[PDB]
Amino acid sequence: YTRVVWCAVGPEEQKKCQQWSQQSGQNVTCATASTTDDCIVLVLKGEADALNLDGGYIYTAGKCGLVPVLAENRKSSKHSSLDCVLRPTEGYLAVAVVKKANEGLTWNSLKDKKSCHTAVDRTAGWNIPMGLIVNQTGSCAFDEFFSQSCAPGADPKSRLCALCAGDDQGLDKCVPNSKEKYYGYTGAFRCLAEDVGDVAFVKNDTVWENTNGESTADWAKNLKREDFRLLCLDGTRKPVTEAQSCHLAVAPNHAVVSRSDRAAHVEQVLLHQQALFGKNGKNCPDKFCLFKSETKNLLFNDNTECLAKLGGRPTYEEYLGTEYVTAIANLKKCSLEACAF
Ligand SMILES: *[C@@H]1O[C@H](CO)[C@@H](O[C@@H]2O[C@H](CO)[C@@H](O[C@H]3O[C@H](CO)[C@@H](O[C@@H]4O[C@H](CO)[C@@H](O)[C@H](O)[C@@H]4O)[C@H](O)[C@@H]3O)[C@H](O)[C@H]2NC(C)=O)[C@H](O)[C@H]1NC(C)=O
Ligand SMILES: *[C@@H]1O[C@H](CO)[C@@H](O[C@@H]2O[C@H](CO)[C@@H](O[C@@H]3O[C@H](CO)[C@@H](O)[C@H](O)[C@@H]3O)[C@H](O)[C@H]2NC(C)=O)[C@H](O)[C@H]1NC(C)=O
Ligand SMILES: OCC1O[C@H](O[C@@H]2OC(CO)[C@@H](O)[C@H](O)[C@H]2O)[C@H](O)[C@@H](O)[C@@H]1O
Ligand SMILES: *[C@@H]1O[C@H](CO)[C@@H](O)[C@H](O)[C@H]1NC(C)=O
Ligand SMILES: [Fe+3]
Ligand SMILES: [Zn+2]
Ligand SMILES: [Zn+2]
Numbered sequence: 001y002t003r004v005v006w007c008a009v010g011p012e013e014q015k016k017c018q019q020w021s022q023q024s025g026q027n028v029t030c031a032t033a034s035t036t037d038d039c040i041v042l043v044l045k046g047e048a049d050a051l052n053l054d055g056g057y058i059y060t061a062g063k064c065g066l067v068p069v070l071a072e073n074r075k076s077s078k079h080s081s082l083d084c085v086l087r088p089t090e091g092y093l094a095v096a097v098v099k100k101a102n103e104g105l106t107w108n109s110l111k112d113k114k115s116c117h118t119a120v121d122r123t124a125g126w127n128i129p130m131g132l133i134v135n136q137t138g139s140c141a142f143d144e145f146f147s148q149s150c151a152p153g154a155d156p157k158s159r160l161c162a163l164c165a166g167d168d169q170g171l172d173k174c175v176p177n178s179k180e181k182y183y184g185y186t187g188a189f190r191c192l193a194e195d196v197g198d199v200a201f202v203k204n205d206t207v208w209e210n211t212n213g214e215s216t217a218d219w220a221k222n223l224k225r226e227d228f229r230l231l232c233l234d235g236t237r238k239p240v241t242e243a244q245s246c247h248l249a250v251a252p253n254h255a256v257v258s259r260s261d262r263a264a265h266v267e268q269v270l271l272h273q274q275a276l277f278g279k280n281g282k283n284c285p286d287k288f289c290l291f292k293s294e295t296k297n298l299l300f301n302d303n304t305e306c307l308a309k310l311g312g313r314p315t316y317e318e319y320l321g322t323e324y325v326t327a328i329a330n331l332k333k334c335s336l337e338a339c340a341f
Contacts, residue, residue, distance in 0.1 A: 004269045007039035007048035008032045008299065010177030016298045023277070023288040027269060035153070035176050036119075040064065041341055043259060050258040050266045052300050055123045055320055059328050061257050062316030064339040069263050070270055071255040071319075072301055073308040074205070084279070084306035085271070093204040093247040094124035096231040097192060097240070105198060107231045114163060115146040116191030116200040118184050119176040120153035123251040123324075125188055129201045131331040132233075132248060140334035150191050152176035152183045163196050178296065186210065186295060190219055199231065203251065204243040205303055215295050249327075252320050254301060255310075270307060279305055 008017040008030055017030035031048040033039045040061050042048035050069065053061060058068060071089045079087055098105050105113065110133075118125025130142045137145065143160055153176035154160035161174035165181040172179045182191040185206040192200035193210075209215060211223040229237040232246040258266040276283050277290035284290065291304045300307075312318065317325055329336050 001265070002269060003027060003029060004050060004266055005029050005031050005048045006299070007042050007051040009036050009039055009051070010034060010175075010179050012178045012296065013298045016293055019288060020273075020277070020290060020299075023283065024273060028273065037340070040066070043257075044341065046259070049262050050256055050270075052254055052256050054118075054254050055252045055324065056121045056127045056328065058252075058255060058257060058316055059320060059325065060121065060340060062320075063337075064341065065260065066257045066316070067260045067263055068255045068310060068314055068316055068319045069258050069267050070307040071253045071310060072304045073253065073306050074301075074303045075305050085274075085308050087308055088311060089253045089308060091250040091252055092124070093243050094128045094249045094251050095202065095204050095207070095243055095247050096129060097189070097200045097202060097207060098198060098229050098231060098237070099192070099195070100227050100229050102198060105231075106235050106237060107233055108235050110199060110231075111145060112147045113198040114196070115149040115151070116163070116182060116188040116197035117149060117151040118188045118202065120151050120160075124185075124203045124248075125201045126151065127328055127331060128249045128251070131327045134331055134334060142334065148197075150174070150180075150182040150188070150197065152180050152187075163191065165196075178298065184297060185301075186297060193219060193223055201248075204240075204247065207240045209295060209303065217295060220295075249324075252324060255319065256307065257316075267309075274307055278307075 006017050006028055008014040014032040021029050031042055033042055036057050039051050044064055073084055073087055073089055120126050133145055134142055148162040149160045150163035151160045152174050156174045164174040166173035167179045174180060185202050188200045188202050189206045189210055191197045210220045211225045225240050228240055230240055230246045232238055238246040277288050291300050293302060295302055
């Protein structure tokens with residue numbers, strides 16, 4: 001009832017969820033699945049209540065009747081007065097990032113190069129860049145465009161997984177969960193940083209959070225912002241400070257979804273959970289911080305300031321916006337009134 005079952009994707013999120021569970025006095029409990037799609041199915045069956053999803057998955061979930069409940073909100077600049085929970089979301093910038101040293105690589109010479117994607121079906125890592133590439137190429141053979149990639153969630157024996165590395169034992173290659181070394185925003189940026197790929201499709205924030213000492217992780221220690229460039233759609237390369245004028249799209253923020261019949265209850269529990277474990281929460285950083293996990297973005301993104309209420313009781317189509325929704329519909333004609341399960 002006032003007990004919510006959260007769905008965790010893979011073993012590291014499970015571990016974080018368990019801690020949250022313990023600290024919440026079991027107001028929150030945990031179910032675990034190997035992929036986000038499987039978590040969506042748990043939610044449909046009523047065996048889990050909720051999870052926080054990237055926009056590409058909100059589209060999947062939406063067709064099956066799930067609804068957005070609250071949205072990640074990061075630090076803003078305009079609307080200084082408003083409380084975080086009431087502040088409108090701004091959205092993130094999807095970018096394509098390369099090494100400065102890889103000169104003469106631009107948007108127009110990406111063909112046959114190596115790519116790093118957060119996961120198949122995700123906004124910045126897949127839907128935006130592959131949608132543009134299909135568009136520009138006039139062809140649904142997006143699996144042939146790059147020579148090799150790491151795109152968690154594709155066929156492990158395909159060239160889309162050739163660059164994925166699996167877990168510290170080499171198992172679970174290309175699975176779309178954090179066990180895969182190059183999964184997610186951080187994984188795809190690591191894939192570029194280690195020069196496994198030529199380009200990473202991530203968001204603007206990922207570059208800043210993993211360079212110039214912001215990350216203490218071994219692979220990101222010595223990374224410098226100046227060693228990276230953004231690829232712009234006009235064929236130019238720009239410094240990472242110019243993301244405002246050099247992105248592939250603005251993406252809708254990740255948001256918590258649930259079955260509509262459970263939305264109201266998930267919302268109230270979460271609002272109270274963040275008062276306890278959120279940014280300035282009563283027990284964070286004392287006992288547990290919901291929005292921390294050492295740059296690994298477990299359950300929620302680490303840069304989340306709060307979960308915010310949605311202005312308008314959005315359907316998922318309204319939450320995603322008509323320009324994003326049509327982009328996805330078009331790309332999925334290669335790979336409408338449905339539910340995949
Ligand atoms: C692309 O993404 C980056 C990363 O999100 C965006 O850069 C962020 O811009 C914010 C303003 O919108 C900065 O906000 C404030 O944050 C703090 C405190 O208020 C200040 O500096 C911080 O100091 C502490 C030191 O302990 C650290 O936690 C932080 O790393 C940072 O050094 C800052 O003066 C400012 O008031 C925010 O810092 C900043 N994030 C980083 C890491 O630089 C960027 O706007 C975005 N670009 C676009 C076009 O969206
Ligand atoms: C890949 O190309 C397809 C085909 O063009 C793109 O789909 C098209 O997107 C545009 C812009 O969102 C749609 O037009 C819009 O119509 C509304 C309503 O009139 C208007 O308010 C907007 O100003 C705009 O004109 C268009 O309907 C849509 N076309 C199709 C076939 O549905 C798609 O966006 C491209 N993918 C990417 C990632 O850009
Ligand atoms: O993509 C930007 C963005 O918009 C979101 O929702 C909304 O987008 C439109 C039209 O583009 C609209 O109709 C809305 O009213 C609207 O709010 C996001 O979810 C979001 O966070 C974005 O950043
Ligand atoms: C658990 O939820 C109950 C019901 O609102 C509430 O009394 C209590 O504050 C919650 N405990 C924690 C630690 O979240
Ligand atoms: Fe995303
Ligand atoms: Zn723009
Ligand atoms: Zn509406």
